[PDB]
Amino acid sequence: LSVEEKAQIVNEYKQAEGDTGSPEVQVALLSANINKLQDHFKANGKDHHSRRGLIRMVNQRRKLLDYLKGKDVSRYTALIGRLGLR
RNA sequence: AGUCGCUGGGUAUAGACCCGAAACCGGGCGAUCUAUCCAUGAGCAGGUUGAAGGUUAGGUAACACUGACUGGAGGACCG
Numbered sequence: 771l772s773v774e775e776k777a778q779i780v781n782e783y784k785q786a787e788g789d790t791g792s793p794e795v796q797v798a799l800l801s802a803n804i805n806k807l808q809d810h811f812k813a814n815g816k817d818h819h820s821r822r823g824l825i826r827m828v829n830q831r832r833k834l835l836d837y838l839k840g841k842d843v844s845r846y847t848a849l850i851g852r853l854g855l856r
Numbered sequence: 857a858g859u860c861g862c863u864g865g866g867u868a869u870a871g872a873c874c875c876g877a878a879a880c881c882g883g884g885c886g887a888u889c890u891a892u893c894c895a896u897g898a899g900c901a902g903g904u905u906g907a908a909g910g911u912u913a914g915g916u917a918a919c920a921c922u923g924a925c926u927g928g929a930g931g932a933c934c935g
C-alpha cells in the first residue's frame with residue numbers, strides 16, 4: 771500500500787483526533803490492504819510464503835472487532851455498516 | 857503280270873452307333889428383392905425417473921462448501 775493511500779484513510783475515518791491509534795483507524799487500514807492483495811493471488815497461485823502474510827492480517831482484524839464490541843455497540847455497527855463486513 | 861473300274865470287310869481324318877456331365881472362355885442383361893451410401897420427406901399412445909445448471913438463504917478474506925426453490929439430461933425405465 772502506498773503512502774498517500776494511507777493518508778487518504780486516516781483523514782477519512784479519524785475520530786476527530788489527528789491520531790492513528792484508535793481501532794476505527796486500525797481496522798480501516800487493514801481492510802483496504804486485504805482487498806488489494808486479492809488479485810495478486812489470482813495471478814500468483816503457488817505463492818505460498820506470501821499467502822502466510824495475508825492470514826496474519828485477517829486474524830488481526832477479527833481481534834480488534836471483538837475488542838470494539840467488548841466496549842461499545844454504537845461504535846461497532848457504525849463501523850461494520852460503513853465497510854460492509856461479517 | 858500287272859493296272860483301272862464296281863460291290864463287300866477293314867483303316868486314317870472330320871461330332872463318326874445314340875443319349876448323358878461337373879466345369880472353362882467371349883459379347884451382353886439385371887441393385888423394382890437384398891447389401892452398404894446419397895438427396896428430400898414423416899412416424900413414435902401413454903406413464904415414470906430425475907443430472908448439469910440457475911435462483912435465493914447460510915457460509916468463506918475470497919473460492920470452499922450447505923439448504924431450499926426451480927430445472928428438464930439420457931445409445932435412461934415400464935408400455
Ligand SMILES: [Mg+2]
Ligand atoms: Mg434403379
Ligand SMILES: [Mg+2]
Ligand atoms: Mg432401390
